[PDB]
Design a protein around this ligand. Structure first.
Ligand SMILES: C[C@@H](CNC(=O)c1ccc2c(c1)NC(=O)CCS2)N1CCOCC1
Ligand SMILES: C[C@@H](CNC(=O)c1ccc2c(c1)NC(=O)CCS2)N1CCOCC1
Length: 130
């Protein structure tokens, strides 16, 4: 319905705003764009589903997220990709893992404080009805 489309539009506005705040945080610069295969040629064979904050914006605009739960699956994917690709004790790996966990924790904290739980419940019930 039209009222439901208004709900999903508000969801998209909210998600663009959260995503922008993550993307401008200097800690998360490494997550802002797709990984370049020239810099790390082994990435596409290890990481089966690359994800990054620019791709998240593209998916918002393609209406791929109908709930914040589905949005957070892609944030979690950015983080789990980083943990999987950087598992070693080396400081370069440990820095990226720390940033990845900070990205996840920051996204979840913004949503816990700013997402109304009845709004999310409404999105989930619309999604379930289709
Ligand atoms: C400028 C682009 C492209 N850079 C890379 O994809 C990249 C991936 C892994 C490493 C490095 C660069 N750096 C190294 O020193 C080699 C070992 S780790 N970035 C992509 C992610 O977000 C935006 C910026
Ligand atoms: C080895 C680098 C630290 N690592 C990165 O800068 C980096 C950049 C982009 C990505 C990644 C790492 N890897 C990921 O998995 C996230 C998505 S791409 N150092 C930087 C300072 O000087 C020395 C070397």
């Amino acid at each position: 319905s039209m009222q439901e489309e208004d709900t999903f539009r508000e969801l998209r506005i909210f998600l663009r705003n959260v995503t922008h705040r993550l993307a401008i945080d200097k800690r998360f610069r490494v997550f802002t764009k797709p990984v370049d295969p020239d810099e790390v040629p082994d990435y596409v064979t290890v990481i089966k589903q690359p994800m990054d904050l620019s791709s998240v914006i593209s998916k918002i605009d393609l209406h791929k997220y109908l709930t914040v739960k589905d949005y957070l699956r892609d944030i979690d994917l950015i983080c789990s990709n980083a943990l999987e690709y950087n598992p070693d004790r080396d400081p370069g790996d440990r820095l990226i893992r720390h940033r990845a966990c900070a990205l996840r924790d920051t996204a979840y904290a913004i949503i816990k404080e700013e997402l109304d739980e009845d709004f999310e419940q409404l999105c989930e019930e619309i999604q379930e009805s289709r």
